[PDB]
Point group: D2
Chain length 334, copies 4
Amino acid sequence: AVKVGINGFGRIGRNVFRAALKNPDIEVVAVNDLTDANTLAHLLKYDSVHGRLDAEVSVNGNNLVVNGKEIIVKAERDPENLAWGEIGVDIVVESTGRFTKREDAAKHLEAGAKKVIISAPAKNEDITIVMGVNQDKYDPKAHHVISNASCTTNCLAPFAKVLHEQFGIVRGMMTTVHSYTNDQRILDLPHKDLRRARAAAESIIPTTTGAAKAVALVLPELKGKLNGMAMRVPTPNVSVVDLVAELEKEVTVEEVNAALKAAAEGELKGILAYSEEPLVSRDYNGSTVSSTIDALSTMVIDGKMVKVVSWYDNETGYSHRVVDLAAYIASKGL
Amino acid sequence: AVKVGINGFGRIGRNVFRAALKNPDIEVVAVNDLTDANTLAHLLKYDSVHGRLDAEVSVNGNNLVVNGKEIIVKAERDPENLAWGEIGVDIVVESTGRFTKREDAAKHLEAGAKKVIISAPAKNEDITIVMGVNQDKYDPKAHHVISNASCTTNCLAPFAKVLHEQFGIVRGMMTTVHSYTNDQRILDLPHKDLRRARAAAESIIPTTTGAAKAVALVLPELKGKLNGMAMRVPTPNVSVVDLVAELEKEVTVEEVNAALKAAAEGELKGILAYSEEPLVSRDYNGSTVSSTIDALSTMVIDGKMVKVVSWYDNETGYSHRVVDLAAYIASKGL
Amino acid sequence: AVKVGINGFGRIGRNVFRAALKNPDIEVVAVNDLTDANTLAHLLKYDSVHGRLDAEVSVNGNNLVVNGKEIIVKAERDPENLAWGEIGVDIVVESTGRFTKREDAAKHLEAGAKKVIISAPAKNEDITIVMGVNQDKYDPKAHHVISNASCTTNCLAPFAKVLHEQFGIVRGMMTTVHSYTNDQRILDLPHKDLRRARAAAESIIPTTTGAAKAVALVLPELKGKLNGMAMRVPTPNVSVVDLVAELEKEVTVEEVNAALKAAAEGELKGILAYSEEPLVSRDYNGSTVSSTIDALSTMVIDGKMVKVVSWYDNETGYSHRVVDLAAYIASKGL
Amino acid sequence: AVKVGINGFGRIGRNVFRAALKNPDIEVVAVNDLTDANTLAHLLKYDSVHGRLDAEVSVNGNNLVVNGKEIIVKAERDPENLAWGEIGVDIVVESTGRFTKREDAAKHLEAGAKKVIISAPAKNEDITIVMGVNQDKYDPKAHHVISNASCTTNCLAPFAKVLHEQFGIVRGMMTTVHSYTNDQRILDLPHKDLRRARAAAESIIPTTTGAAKAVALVLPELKGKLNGMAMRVPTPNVSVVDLVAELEKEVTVEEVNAALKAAAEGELKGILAYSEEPLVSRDYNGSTVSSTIDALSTMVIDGKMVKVVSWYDNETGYSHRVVDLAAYIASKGL
């Protein structure tokens, strides 16, 4: 159905490709990337975190062959030159990480794509959608360059929505206990961020996150209510959001969990999940939802301050999200 | 000068021992442990987190010779039999982890020690002390079985005092991103806590902590105002407390860090440290203070909610503290 | 069809169980273990290495219920008392690690079993079998207490076979670069091996291995010909055998790889595997074969000294082997 | 006293700098790097593997201040323009790994330096020296561009020399169980070697090494006799060489170890060390010798085939060697 194009075949583009595999409504017809297809097929087939792909993968000249379908692999430095229109690609997933400003991402529209999905926080985008939270606010007439926000923001937004609507958030702080990402260094090497310059798998690393400020793009009533940071730790995947919120109503742990459980089971089914089991981060590896409440961690003090901890597979969850956004957009007409 | 005996020469016992070499007022004359002296001396000399003890260590019979000082190695299963008194031991550091109830810990006093310092949160102790917070409260005449609380309570208590005294805490919530300890399992193996049963070096494992509620023992005024949880991560030593608190006065980040810096430099000097550098966990391994403020992480929202981040080497800091209390108690009279 | 009883439900009991689930011809009717059924259902369901078991697991009083079937759980400290005979269990997988001496292991026979498989090296067993190497030497009339050797011996044996057979081994030395085990310590702690007393996820640990010398039990001709050690490294599963051997014949890499490859596709299929891809340890997690030749690592010197590197998932391969042997043994007459 | 300048201030230039501090005959007066002075000063101060520099470090505009001495920091892309001459730099440590061919590295002779030490295997160099094995072969007249080889060659060479000299090596094969390096990827990312594209802290990764053949440069009589490979494992520093060799003489475990211990104590004192303690990789972090024989692992089969296991701090020992080499060259005249 919707013919999709992926710019950048790094971790996110490959994870999106793996997510799309599972979808009959979306069809990845071409990727753009300067790495040789041999490398790229090796990387698609074998993953240290996600394991071997469940599909036969091979290389034909410069293209990829995944279960008999040949994937055109372009190798343009210029988005402008991708000719998405010529191969009937409607939607472009912009994952290089170099085209996050609207003017750079609109080059894919110039080349014929009809919509661009920036898989990361952007500048000047038409709209930032956090699926489950504000997809209803997408206007096909007016929104062509769309942001799917960050992994952290997709985790937080669903449950800040529930808490906010159900009890009202006065203010709140988050900390994300996150796995190392390809942004960090293996051993101490120069980095913009002096924290992130330190051997990644050796320390607990205080760092920044715009996740808390970005929840405002999807829930405007939370504008100026949240703040938070990050702690990168020696795990390669799965991270957790820890939110301390000062509520307007007086609650109990049970009320809170009960409201969280209802949204997961109803309105947010498939996005927000709820768990009453005592699991650890390796158990959420491969998870596709954007946030799972760790129900036994919910805690309340003086009936107004609540602590809510939620799990996210930061590579799978987010990737499933891009494919759903892709699908959602197309349903609104292209 | 004060003669000390240690019950249990595991990590805390070896750690206390290491710290004591540096305090000229203390003099460790005996340790009690079931392990053969060869292994204990191998373990004292060589440590994976702390490196090689700087001291000649040998075995003379069933004893250890550390810097040419004979250390009696008893191997008694019951505290009633240590007969501290024959050897002249005044203070006993109870670090087995087994005799934390008054009932067990008081047996050493029966055996002849003048005082007992339980190197863990205790039950029915005479008093629980956090050096820098309430050592003032110690009564030599009535307090004989003293608790040194935990590593995490020694971390939070000192900076909760400042916050509370400057701007007053309404309610707060903490999370400690903590290094794995010997209480966890290597591979999935049985355990009372199904969280702690999982491969410790492979995950992010939420677990409970009593460190928040235990602040109320040392700062009575914070009774029912703090709560928290822990997350053990794949690091061998060094932890971080993340406090989110609702203050009474509207404040600034600058005002919050100047109160803490002032404290660190004045009254709490040696206990509380203040850092304005972008350091990481490995940088604090070997740090002897109880709490180091990660000044670059202070945050406020709405002038009332603050986020404070404090570093601590859960094994080195706590140890120094134990020796500090020993030296402090002895200074009041035996 | 063949009813199996499992003595001990730790990692090997649990993996053997998980392995058995995939053979309709084996049926685990009962396990014997002192941990609570709540703790065992939990540990059966979630593994940090092996992931979630795809099977409905619940507790039914004192028993487990897995996929429809109800597994009786026993909690006998004494095998004498197991009454294998009355529940109709024919083969007992003895995997406690406490009854490796024929005499102890034989207690399962007194209680009703027909055969015993010791999942580890044994003392005075009737026979020690490496499936693919000597199951043909198994005698249903004379062999009742069987050993399945160790994980490492199952890796080495199959290709030492082939190498010896084709070219002839004069002398050889192995090193196994092995994953940490439940036998090591999280943090420096007393252990009989002073090397295994050190923090397992922090160092490269030289240690001993019986593996090399135990090949002689399956290939008598290599008696006195091989030797080796182990190095435990900071990974939780998957290991690698490195063999440097002096051959009697002049050979080339192509010669040795082709032989290795012929046996894997022929006689040793499903036990020995061959790979010309540049994979890493993680890619072998989940692997059921006993040994996978890393073909790109075969190396020759003076036509006579070869280096062969072979992979093994030391938890899964080994578990599939115990399952296969139970089925081989049943098949020869019970 | 001798004035050295470093080209490239990465881990090796910084490790050489730290080592230099101790050497009183050497004096680094300038470093060349494109990284700002701020990051550089941060990275020299704190190290995730070596700890905090015992030196006061600061920034004086674009330069570094280390214990009062202002170190000039140039930032030229091309060695010819470094004007070593005007600042009086006689020796240049070429640690970028970009100017390994003679012709490139000789560009520093053009900017005024008298000698260049390439801290890596080189191509067409005047001489490759392994300190303690062939430094006697150095000619001040004939040799201007010199290679210090690799960390791995520096570990093998000193003990292969001994074994051969004493027993005569017929053929041999090595495995280096190595720490990850800055050359590997944190998560699966493109790389020329598909083994090294794989998340480094998650696996055992086989890869090549030239250290084995590299030894003939230093011991020509072993030309064509050694070959070997590498296994990159999840540790940040400290590695071990595993040598299996076929000797010419019949030997005993005991004669092998005495020869090495004899080497260790006289001739090779400071290069080769000998250990009879059951230590682990962590115990060697900071070791400045090149090779440390793990006496407890020596093994013999048929009086002829032997196993020798040597420890090397791959960043510390190698650095001290460069410093040692810089001081030796200089002692012969400049």
